[PDB]
Amino acid sequence: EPPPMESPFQREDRNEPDRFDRDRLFSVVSRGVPEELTGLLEYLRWNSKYLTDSAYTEGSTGKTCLMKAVLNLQDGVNACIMPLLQIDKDSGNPKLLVNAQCTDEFYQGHSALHIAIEKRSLQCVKLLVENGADVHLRACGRFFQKHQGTCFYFGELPLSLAACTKQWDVVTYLLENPHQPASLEATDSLGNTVLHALVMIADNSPENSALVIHMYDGLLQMGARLCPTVQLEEISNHQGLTPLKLAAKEGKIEIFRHILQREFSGPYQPLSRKFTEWCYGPVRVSLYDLSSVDSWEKNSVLEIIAFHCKSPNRHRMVVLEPLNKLLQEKWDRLVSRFFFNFACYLVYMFIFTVVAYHQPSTFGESMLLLGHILILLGGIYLLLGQLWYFWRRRLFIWISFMDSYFEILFLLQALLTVLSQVLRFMETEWYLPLLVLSLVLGWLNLLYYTRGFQHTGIIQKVILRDLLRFLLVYLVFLFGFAVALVSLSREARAPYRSILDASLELFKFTIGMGELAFQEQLRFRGVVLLLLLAYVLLTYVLLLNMLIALMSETVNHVADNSWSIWKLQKAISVLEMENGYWWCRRKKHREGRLLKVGTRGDGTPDERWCFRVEEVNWAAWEKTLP
Amino acid sequence: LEEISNHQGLTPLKLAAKEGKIEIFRHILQREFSGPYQPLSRKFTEWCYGPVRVSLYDLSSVDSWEKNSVLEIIAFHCKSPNRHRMVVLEPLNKLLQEKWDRLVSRFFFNFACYLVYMFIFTVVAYHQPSTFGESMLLLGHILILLGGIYLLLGQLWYFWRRRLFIWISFMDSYFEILFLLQALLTVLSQVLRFMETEWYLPLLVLSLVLGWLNLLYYTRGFQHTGIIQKVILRDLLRFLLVYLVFLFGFAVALVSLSREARAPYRSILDASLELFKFTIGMGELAFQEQLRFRGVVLLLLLAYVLLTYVLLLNMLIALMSETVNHVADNSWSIWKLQKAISVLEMENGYWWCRRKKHREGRLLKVGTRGDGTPDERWCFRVEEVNWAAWEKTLP
Ligand SMILES: CCCCCCCCCC(=O)OC[C@H](COP(=O)([O-])OCCN)OC(=O)CCCCCCCCC
Ligand SMILES: CCCCCCCCCC(=O)OC[C@H](COP(=O)([O-])OCCN)OC(=O)CCCCCCCCC
C-alpha cells in the first residue's frame, strides 16, 4: 500500500551537539518555527551527514525535510524553508536538497517544486527557483500517470502542472525568469509537451472546456514571443501525434473544435487556422488550414477519427468544419465508384444465383462450367480483398464492431464461396450446405450499399446489447427445463429423447415455429404439463421485462444522431475508397490550394494549404443586425 | 452524547440507518469541524493534491466486526426504499468494495461447487434405470443426498438468523427461499427413492428445474450481468385477480352448458385449464359443433377472448405509463446492495465452520479528547478523485 503524501495523524515510515534526528526535524518544519532549527547544522558537521541522507528522509518513499515544509504551508509561506536551504549549503551537501526527488514507485520524481505549484504559493515557487530549483524535473510515478483509480496526470512537469491547475501567475514566472527559464517544448516520459498535457486533462464538460481552451491559447501567444521560430503545435509525442491529432484520438471534441477553427485578429494572427475571406449577409466564406488534416498525408486526423478513435463522439467530429465539407467533396468525387462497386457486386450475385439455381444433381454445361469459374475467381477476389483490409485495419474492427460488421460478413461469404467450389472439385456432397449459406449471406450483404442513398442511409446498438443480456437468462431457462423433460421421459420408456432435441422443441415453440408435445401417453403427464406451463409463463415474464427495459431506455434517452452516424459511415467508406483496390492503388490527390496567408515568425512567407468553406447561416446573421 | 443507545440498543447513527433518514445519515457519517470542536467530527482530511482528496473516516459502530453494525442494520434491518442509496455513501462504498475484493474468490468458489453439484445431479438423473456402472450411480446418489442435506442445513441456519429480513425484503432474498425448496425436494426425493415409491420422480425433475434456475443467483458477481422487475410483479398479481374471475366465470358456464345436454368441457378444472392454455398460446379452443347450443358456446368463447384482450391491453398500458413517467437509474445502486447482502453473509462463513472477523481500519491518534485521553479512533482511509468539484474551486 502506498504511504500517504502528508498525514498529520500517521507518522512517516522509517523503512558534542545535541541530537537532531528526523522526527525532531520533521516536527519543526511542520510547525513553521525557524527558531528551533538551531543545532541542526552543528549536528550534520559533527557526524558528516547531510539533509538528503536516507536517515533524514522517509525510507518508504523518499520525502525530504524540505518537502515536509512545503506540504505544511501556513497561508502560503513557511518560515522554515529559507533556513533549511541555508543549512544544506553550509553542510557541504554534494546534492542539492532543492532538487531532491522521491524513489517510491507510486511517487517517483516528485520534488518540492511540484508541491509549491500545487499549493498555489507563488512566494514559495519564487523562493525555490532562486535557490536553484530545476524546472525540468519529471514526476514519473504511478500516481502521476493516467490510469484507473487514484491518479493525477498533469504532464509530469512543473510547467505543465501550473498550466493544468490554472495558475497563469506561476506559468508566467516559470517561463520568463532570470534564474532558470522553462521551455515550452519540454517532454515527459510519454513525450507529451505542455500542449499535449492539456488535451489529456480536457473534458467535454463546459467548465473544463473553458479552462483548457483559455490555457491553450495563452501558451501559444506566449510561445510566439519566447520561441518565435519553434512551432509548438507540430511537436509529436512518442506515438507521433500532434496536439491536434491527440485530441482526435482521445475524443476531446471541445478542444478539437477550437483547434480546428480558431481566428486571432491583429497580432498573433499566424497562430490561427481559420481565416475569414469575405462575408455578404448570411454568407460567410473562410479559409481553413488543412495541415495534418487532409487524407493525403499519412496518419491524418480523418484516418485517426475513423480508424483509431474509440470515443463515442467520433460521429460528431465528422460534422465540424472543415471536416464536413472535405468529406463531402471526397464523397462527390467517389460517388461514381461506390455505385460501380455496387453494380459489380450485384452482377456477381446474379451469376452466383443463376448457377446455383441451374446446377445438376454441351453448350448448357459449358456455360455452367464458365459460370463456376467466375464464381471461384469472384470469391478469391473478395477473399484477397478482405484479407488486405483485415491486415491494414485489424484494430479498428476490434474497437468498432457496429461500424464494420459487414467487413466480417464479406469475408465469411468469401470463405464459404471459395471452399464450396473446392469441395465441388473434391466431389463431396458437403459443398451444398456451404453454397446455400453463402447465397443467403451474399444477398444479405447488399444492405451495405444502402449508405450511398440519403433516404436509406440515414437504436440498433441498444437492441443488440439487451438481446445478449437476456439471452443468458433464457438459455438457463431453456437448458433447465429441457433436462427435466428428457429425464422424465428417459426413465419411463419421442419428442423429448435428448437434450438437443428437447431444447430445439422448446425453442421452436417460443418463436412460433412449432408446437409442444404434452406426452399424454406418459404416466406422469401432469408433471410434463406443469413443467411446460412453467416454461411458457417464465418465458413470457422474461420477454415482458425485455420489452419494458427496451421501452425505458429509448424513451428516456432522447437523441437524434441519424444524420451524424450516416456521415461517419460515408467517412469510413470514402477513406477506404481513396486507397483503391488491392490489385491497383490510386495516387492520393491533395485537397486545398497553397495560399500565402502572410508572414511567419521567422520571416518566411506563411504559405498554407487552405481549404475554402462557404457557410450560410441566417439565424446567426439576424442576431448581429442592430 | 452520540454513543447513548435507546431501549433497542441503537445509537443516533444506527437509528438513522434503520429508519432510513439518509440525509442526516450522510451528514453524521461524513462531518468535519475545523479548529474548535474538532473531536466532534468523524471525517478527517489527510491530504489533497488537485482533484485527489484523501480523508480518514471513523469506523466506530460502522465496521462489520462489531455486533449490530450499521452495515448489518442497512442490509438486514431496514425497510426504507433508500437502503440501496445508503450503501453508496462513503466510507460504506469503499468498505464494502474492499470486503468484496477479499471475498471475491470464495464467491466463485461457492459458484464452482454448486455447478459441480448440479453436474452430478444432472448426470445421475439422466442415467438412472426404470457392477461398476451401478456402484458409481449408487455413489452418485449418496453425493446428491449429502449435498441436499448440506444445502438444507445451510438454509435453515440462514433462516434462523435472518427471519425478519426476508419477510420485509422478498425481492432481495427470493433466491434464499428457492435454495431451501430445491434442498427440500432433493432430500425428500432420495428418501422416497429409499421407500421404493414412484412419487420420487415428480420431486426429482422439479428440483432439477429449480436447481438449474438457481444458478442465476451467482450473476451478481459479474458487473455486466449483475447491473423494473418490481413493477412487473406488482402489476401481474393485480391483474391476475381480474383474470381468475374471468377464467372461473366462463369455465362454469361452459361446463353447465355441456353437462346438461350430454368432452373438452366436462369439469371446472378441465375447462379452466383449456381456456388458460389457449390464452398463453399453448393450445386451441373446442367449439362443440356437435352440441345443440353451439351458437351459445361460440358467444361465450368470443366474449372470453375479447375480454381477455382488453384486460391484457390495460395491463400493457399500465406498465407503459409507470415506467415511462417514473424515470430513474438505480441499476448500479441496487447491484452494490446485492453485493453488500452477499458479502455480509460470506463474512460469517459456512455453518459448519465460522471465520473470525477481521477488523477493518487502522488505530490512529486523531488528537486529544475532551477528557484529556488521546483521541484514538479506527480510521479508514478513503481516496476520492473528483475533477468536477476541483475545477469549480479554481480561481
Ligand atoms: C487481379 C485483377 C482482378 C481484376 C478484377 C476486377 C473486378 C472489378 C473490381 C470491382 O469492381 O470492385 C469489386 C467490388 C468492390 O467491393 P466493395 O468495395 O464494395 O467491398 C466492400 C466491403 N465492405 O466487389 C465486387 O463487386 C465483388 C467482386 C467480384 C466482382 C467480379 C467482377 C464483376 C464484373 C461485372
Ligand atoms: C459438515 C461438513 C460438510 C463439508 C462440505 C464442504 C462442501 C464445500 C462447501 C462449499 O463449497 O460451499 C457450499 C456452496 C455455498 O452455497 P452458497 O453460499 O452459494 O448459497 C447461497 C444461497 N443464497 O453451496 C454448494 O456448492 C452446494 C452444496 C453442495 C456442494 C457439495 C460439495 C461440492 C464439491 C465439489
Q: How far apart are CA B249 and CA A322, in angstroms?
A: 72
- Distance from Cα A364 to the centre of ligand 1, integer Å: 26
Positive or negative: CA dihedral B265, B271, B274, B275: positive
Q: Which helix (H) or strand (E) holds A439?
A: helix A431-444
Contacts of B232 in chain A (CB under 8 A): 541, 544-545, 548
Q: Do residues B254 and B265 make contact, with C-beta atoms less than 8 angstroms apart? A: yes
Q: Do residues A166 and B395 make contact, with C-beta atoms less than 8 angstroms apart? A: yes
- Return left, alpha or beta for B125; rule: phi > 0 is left, psi -120 to 50 is alpha, else beta: alpha
Q: Which residues contact A40 (CB under 8 A, 6 or more apart)?
A: A20, A25, A87
Among partner residues B224, B282, B385, which is closest to A150 by beta-carbon distance? B385
Residue located via cell numbers 433516404: A455
Positive or negative: CA dihedral A324, A325, A328, A330: negative
* Coil, helix or strand at residue A74: strand
Q: Which residues contact A444 (CB under 8 A, 6 or more apart)?
A: A409
Contacts of A165 in chain B (CB under 8 A): 50, 394
Nearest residue (by CA) to ligand 2, atom 27, is: B114
And the C-alpha cell for B157?
A: 441456519
Q: How far apart are CA B239 and CA B159, in angstroms?
A: 32
By the 10 Å C-beta count (0-12 exposed, 13-18 middle, 19+ buried), A540 is classed as middle
Residue located via cell numbers 426476508: B166
Q: How many helices (H) and strands (E) does chain A have?
A: 26, 4
Among partner residues A7, A71, A548, which is closest to B232 by beta-carbon distance? A548
Resolution (A): 3.1
Q: Do residues A568 and A578 make contact, with C-beta atoms less than 8 angstroms apart? A: no
And the C-alpha cell for A560?
A: 437524434
List strands edge to edge, sheet with B43-49. B43-49, B52-58, B374-385, B362-368
Which of B108, B145, B150, B182 for mutating ligand 2's site (highest number of atoms within 8 Å of CB)? B150
Atom of ligand 1 nearest to the CA of A407: 23
Q: Is there an atom of ligand 2 within 6 Å of B176 CB?
A: yes
Q: With an 8 Å Cβ cutoff, are B394 and A211 in contact? A: yes
Breaks (C-N over 2.5 A) in chain A follow: 15, 361, 458, 493
By the 10 Å C-beta count (0-12 exposed, 13-18 middle, 19+ buried), B219 is classed as middle
- Give which of A106, A146, A13, A108 is closest to B54, Cα–Cα: A106
Q: What residues pair up with A274 in beta bridges, in sequence order?
A: A288
Q: With an 8 Å Cβ cutoff, are B387 and A118 in contact? A: no
- Distance from Cα A331 to the centre of ligand 1, integer Å: 19
B388-392 long-range CB contacts below 8 Å, 24 or more apart? B388/A205, B388/A207, B389/B51, B390/B50, B390/B51, B391/A205, B391/A207, B391/A208, B391/A211, B392/A207
Written as one letter, the residue type at A83 is P
CA B346 and chain centroid, separation: 15
Q: Do residues A577 and A334 make contact, with C-beta atoms less than 8 angstroms apart? A: yes
Q: Is there an atom of ligand 2 within 6 Å of B150 CB?
A: yes
Q: How far apart are CA B265 and CA B257, in angstroms?
A: 9
Written as one letter, the residue type at A553 is E
Which of A339, A345, A347, A354 for mutating ligand 1's site (highest number of atoms within 8 Å of CB)? A345
Among partner residues A10, A480, A532, which is closest to B212 by beta-carbon distance? A480
Please say whether the structural domain A22-316 has been given the CATH code 1.25.40.20: yes
The vertex-B321 CA angle with B319 and B324, nearest 5°, equals 100
- Indicate which technique resolved this structure: cryo-EM
What is the number of the ligand closest to the CA of B338? Answer: 2
* Distance from the B13 Cα atom to the nearest Cα atom in chain A, whole angstroms: 25
- Give which of B242, B141, B145 is closest to B185, Cα–Cα: B145
Backbone angles phi, psi at B149, to 5 degrees: -70, -35
**Residues contacting ligand 1 via CB (< 6 Å):** A 341, 344-345, 347-348, 378, 381-382, 406-407, 410, 448, 581, 583
Contacts of B237 in chain A (CB under 8 A): none
* A229 CB-side CA count, 13 A: 1
Q: How far apart are CA A264 and CA A275, in angstroms?
A: 9
Q: How far apart are CA B65 and CA B8, in angstroms?
A: 20
Q: How far apart are CA A492 and CA A302, in angstroms?
A: 68
Q: Do residues B359 and B63 make contact, with C-beta atoms less than 8 angstroms apart? A: yes
Q: How far apart are CA A299 and CA A398, in angstroms?
A: 19
* Coil, helix or strand at residue A358: coil
3-class DSSP string for chain B: CCCCCCCCCCCHHHHHHHHCCHHHHHHHHCCCCCCCCHHHCCEEEEEEECCEEEEEEECCCCCCCCCCCHHHHHHHCCCCCCHHHHCCCCCHHHHHHHHHHHCHHHHHHHHHHHHHHHHHHHHHHHCCCCCHHHHHHHHHHHHHHHHHHHHHHHHHHHHHHCHHHHHHCCCCCHHHHHHHHHHHHHHHHHHHHHCCCCCHHHHHHHHHHHHHHHHHHHHHHCHHHHCCHHHHHHHHHHHHHHHHHHHHHHHHHHHHHHHHCCCCCCCHHHHHHHHHHHHCCCCCCCCCCCCCCHHHHHHHHHHHHHHHHHHHHHHHHHHHHHHHHCCCCCHHHHHHHHHHHHHHHHHHECCCCECCCCCCCEEEEEEECCCCCEEEEEEEEEEEECHHHHHHHCC
Contacts of A208 in chain B (CB under 8 A): 387, 391
Among partner residues B46, B126, B202, which is closest to A527 by beta-carbon distance? B202
Q: How far apart are CA B207 and CA B189, in angstroms?
A: 9
* Distance from the A540 Cα atom to the nearest Cα atom in chain B, whole angstroms: 9
Number of neighbours of residue A298 by Cβ within 10 angstroms: 9
Q: With an 8 Å Cβ cutoff, are A516 and B282 in contact? A: yes
- Give which of A315, A375, A387, A380 is closest to A349, Cα–Cα: A375
Q: How far apart are CA B250 and CA B279, in angstroms?
A: 13
